[PDB]
Amino acid sequence: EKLSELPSAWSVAHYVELTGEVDSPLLARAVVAGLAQADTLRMRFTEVWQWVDDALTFELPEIIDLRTNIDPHGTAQALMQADLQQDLRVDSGKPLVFHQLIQVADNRWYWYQRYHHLLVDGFSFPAITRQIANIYCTWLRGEPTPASPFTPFADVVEEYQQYRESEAWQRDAAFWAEQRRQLPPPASLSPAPLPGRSASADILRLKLEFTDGEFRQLATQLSGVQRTDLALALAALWLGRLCNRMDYAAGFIFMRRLGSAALTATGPVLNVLPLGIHIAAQETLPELATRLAAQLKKMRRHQRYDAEQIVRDSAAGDEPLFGPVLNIKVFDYQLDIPDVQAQTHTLATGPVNDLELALFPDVHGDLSIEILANKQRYDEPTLIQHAERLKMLIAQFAADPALLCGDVDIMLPGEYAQLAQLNATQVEIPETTLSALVAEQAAKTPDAPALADARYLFSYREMREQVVALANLLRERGVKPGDSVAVALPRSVFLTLALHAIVEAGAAWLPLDTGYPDDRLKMMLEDARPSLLITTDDQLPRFSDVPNLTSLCYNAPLTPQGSAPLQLSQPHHTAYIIFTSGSTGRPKGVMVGQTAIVNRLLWMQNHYPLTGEDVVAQKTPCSFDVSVWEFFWPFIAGAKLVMAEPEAHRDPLAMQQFFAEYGVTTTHFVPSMLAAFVASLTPQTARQSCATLKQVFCSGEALPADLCREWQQLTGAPLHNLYGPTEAAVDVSWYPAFGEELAQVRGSSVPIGYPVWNTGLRILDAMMHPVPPGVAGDLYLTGIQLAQGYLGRPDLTASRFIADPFAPGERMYRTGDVARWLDNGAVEYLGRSDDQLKIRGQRIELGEIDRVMQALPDVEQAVTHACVINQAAATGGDARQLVGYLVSQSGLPLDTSALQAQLRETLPPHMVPVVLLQLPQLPLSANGKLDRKALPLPELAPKAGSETIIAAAFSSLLGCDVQDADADFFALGGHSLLAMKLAAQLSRQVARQVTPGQVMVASTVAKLATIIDRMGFETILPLREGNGPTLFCFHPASGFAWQFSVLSRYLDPQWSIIGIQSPRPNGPMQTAANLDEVCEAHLATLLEQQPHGPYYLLGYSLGGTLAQGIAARLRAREQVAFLGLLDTWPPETLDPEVLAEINREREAFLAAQQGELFTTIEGNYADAVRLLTTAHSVPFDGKATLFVAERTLQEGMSPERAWSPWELDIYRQDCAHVDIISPGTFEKIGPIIRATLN
Amino acid sequence: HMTSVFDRDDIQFQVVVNHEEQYSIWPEYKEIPQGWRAAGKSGLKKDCLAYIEEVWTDMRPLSLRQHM
């Protein structure tokens, strides 16, 4: 009654080949007698109780005579296998031993033996065999039966109990406790995870003798080194180098019983004990062998301590202590029976967890090895390959015994050829710049659409005119070739134009994120020292403090003066400077040259060709280097680029409306944002928005394969995985994330793939040596696409840009990424070797945050930890949030709220911990290594009428019932991605439109309810502020000129659009009971816009009445070159149908806007009809332009005769009186108007 | 969990220079890569880096200096 779980059923089997004259019945009786002598062989288990039954009997072995068989040998093998394939019932009341005598020839015998693994092991069964043989020979000489040399089962448990209560038990237990305390984690030659206890008894055996004679030379050069310790050192270095690990836990075979007590024992003896191995790259082989020999020498004095006890005290798993296990022991199988040669063959030694490596140096000096591998984790040819690695491993030390363990090369000659093939990316590109490419493409297609947004639309010629103009302005402000220009601009056409102009003048652009605090921006500007800052008028008060900084406000187009390129840009000039978080001091800027980004864009244009039918989206903020291929790549292929709305990259719905609006064919996504985007998608929304997407790219994070298959099924649009740091000119490697290559991905992440043009990937180890496939190593980047370096920081540059040992004179960039290459040559991202994190695509150094937080007043130390605050907030993507843990130097409370608000003045918004927690003492554990699993998570009131639903939504998404208002959505576990779904939910639960940016700027119940529950409502509506002539649009019956918003796109970019309207509080439409008091009231605002010069006017409905009525009023004063009328009729045509028409105008005006105090609309329609019933018209001596809705009323005296007593030209489209102003009609009217205004 | 050598301050590096006079750090126990030469500085990591800080003044590559 000493056991609980029932032991396994695997057994140890073998057979002895006897070549000679054998008397089989006497040998069988000798088997029975020998088995009878040992009292431990008779043992059973009752269930559980493991105990010896002395009443068990043994039966004579079966004698099979296969000499008359067609294949005696193979049939004997089939017999022994037939017994071996069957599992052994452990609870049976019969002995667990089986012997069998097989005869394959007159003089040859196969003596099959099998035991349960709790009876004997690989060391102790030849004792039983040898005693049986001794009885056999003794009987063959006529002497009686020899006695039993085997120790009885009582004396061995007496001795073991002595050891259990001995003073050595506590000493050994303490020793192995200290050993497993400093024991490194296990390693494995198989990339697969370490399973622990294995069930498979079928293993792979491989015997290999090295006839190269290298080991004999290495051993004869190292005379004092014991050959066993030398071969063992070679094996340890071999394992560590193949796994790319200097510290790893292997296993070593010891013995629980020693001396005669081991030679007279039947039960298990061998004791596999944990062995920690530390490889030193500076040590020689004799030093490793010596230190390891002393290590084993210390371990041998405590080897009597059982290993299952080390597991017991520790234990729940699952991972075992050691994967591979090294065996230096030799088992003596030989036995001397007169005139017959005996050879013990092995059939079953039992399951192997991972890998057993046995080393046998012979007396001749050569070396043999025996490999026992798991058939599921390994295969034979790979074992041959690793054995070859060990072979050249030995040869190198044999040639040079002074070789360091760090300079040894374990890579085969063919793998160097593979790496030479994969990194052979040489493609000859021309010496050129971005400005030359853009100018070339513009020379190709001048009239093609290039740049566009909600207001402007430029062709390539117009765009190049604006770029050259702004470049000449920058040059007039003193921007010389080689300088830098900082940029703080909202997303519009003028951001793109700004960057192109900066490049055009031979300068580099420095994108600034206005969300950052002023201290960080001022630091950046002090480091970069730009010649000029391009911003808007409202952001200039922020930078009025910055010393020695010229500014410039660029919000409107300039007068075009030629499109010719300035030819000031050189390939050696810096193209863009992007600051990233530094792990040591202040943030560092990445200077990326022209030729690098030229290679990047030209490659992206070759590998992913774009045409004039393509439409590229501008979604990426300028502070991210991804945007670099959005600002330029479409302009080197003839494609079209379209600006998104500000902070629309955070709203998936806004991205849907944007894609659908412009018909985007090419865009980008961060895997987290991709998950948050497909979360908003239903198949019909996917076919209504994502139907135009032909190419989608993902970079910045490990790309999940499941997300890619989901995106493929929901859209079908080709997805591509790209990889690269900022210091490598955007992206370095590429890999298909759709279709066939996607279906073959076994891992959880899509590989980063193959290198781009003129770029090389090098996965080295800790010793700067290239690693074999499947092995993790540090990633390094080479080639033309590397950055020029860190701006003004030689130390960080020389630290991060190092020497390249495989490319003489060239440099090499240390990414800090851990990766490996697969069987197809594709590189797979695995992780990081530093504290750098990519949170939802954002590059964040934890060291910076730590330093800033421990720079706070009264802070002994502080630790940043990224973690999932609420596990119910993980719908896909990166749900991690930053949490700061502070301890006070005084022991006094820190007031974490003020400390966080103080952190907001130094660190970027996304680098500020959402939660700051104060701890009595920083939770260490063992050696003071800061246990991050001991770090506690942060715990998870008006609640008025409207915000109750907000609290309900919070409780829905966070899974935490929120009774208290004024609760931060982020501190409860929420993040950006979840805030998007929150915005959708509230948007369908509230009539008003809710955006995730409103959750960003105000994170609370009360604040969100406060905000939730543009240009202006004044007389002047600045639809588009240009420079040249101005087209005035008059308000319809609604009194608002909003509906002309979709006209500004079709007009020439130099034009201005100012709509006049009626702000009901003291507005012209209500203060006038005479419908000319308002036609003359608008002259007070129109003549104070442009007093002199010709006039260009446009009106709709009532606005058209107000158009002609002012037209003649100005013709009785300057001139009116253009007066457009949109289905406008004279007041002479209180009618019954016109009220239905006006009602349609009102209905369609307010129903086109889903959102109060806007009831003034309903007033301006009342005031409209009250004024419309009083007829007013003037013959209007001049001429005008008229657009007529064909599907309107009858009367063949239609405007041609109806407006005759008031020269005109008419255009006819099929629409109602309401649709004539709709965007669908402006798709034709717009071009007509512009062509008329030329 | 690699913990790269260049991130470790417990080891001693040395300053190496190419033909473009671009400076870099390199492990002392390793052979200086072809096309690179020692600038006369070794020892602790932060020490070598602080050396590079004052020695490396003109970030431009040598071949682009005469053209400037």
Ligand SMILES: *P(=O)(O)OCC(C)(C)[C@@H](O)C(=O)NCCC(=O)NCCS[C@@H](CS(=O)(=O)NC[C@H]1O[C@@H](n2cnc3c(N)ncnc32)[C@H](O)[C@@H]1O)[C@@H](N)CO
């Ligand atoms: P909330 O306020 O958190 O809102 C979340 C959203 C998504 C709205 C917000 O975070 C957002 O808009 N994010 C966009 C972030 C972004 O576009 N970042 C630039 C992408 S990375 C860039 C260079 S980098 O230095 O910044 N990052 C390099 C770094 O990233 C890892 N990496 C890149 N590519 C990888 C692949 N394919 N697999 C695995 N890891 C990858 C590397 O470790 C590398 O060191 C670009 N050069 C990337 O193309």
